[PDB]
């Protein structure tokens, strides 16, 4: 009798510029500079 929660992930993503730490692995990334 137990219940569990959470979220997901992917095997590969893209490191993204961030305010805090440069190069954070994210679950999906788009492009802003064509």
């Amino acid at each position: 009798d137990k219940i569990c929660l959470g979220h997901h992930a992917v095997s590969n993503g893209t490191k993204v510029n961030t305010l805090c730490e440069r190069g954070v692995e994210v679950v999906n990334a788009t492009e802003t500079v064509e």
């Binding site: 137990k2 219940i3 569990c4």
Partner: protein, 49 residues
């Protein structure tokens, strides 16, 4: 929300899952899932455990 929905019926150890003191079957999984769970039926079941 799941903390206040379980209330005293499930004191959580905090390793990513909640420990239900009383019995909670597949229907009770579904009732917590669609946030219609009421612990008034199982409060006295889970209090003494």
């Amino acid at each position: 929300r799941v903390k206040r929905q379980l209330r005293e019926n499930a004191e959580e150890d905090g390793t990513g899952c909640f420990e239900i003191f009383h019995k909670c079957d597949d229907d009770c999984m579904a009732s917590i899932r669609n946030n219609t769970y009421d612990h008034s039926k199982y409060r006295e079941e889970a209090m003494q455990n």
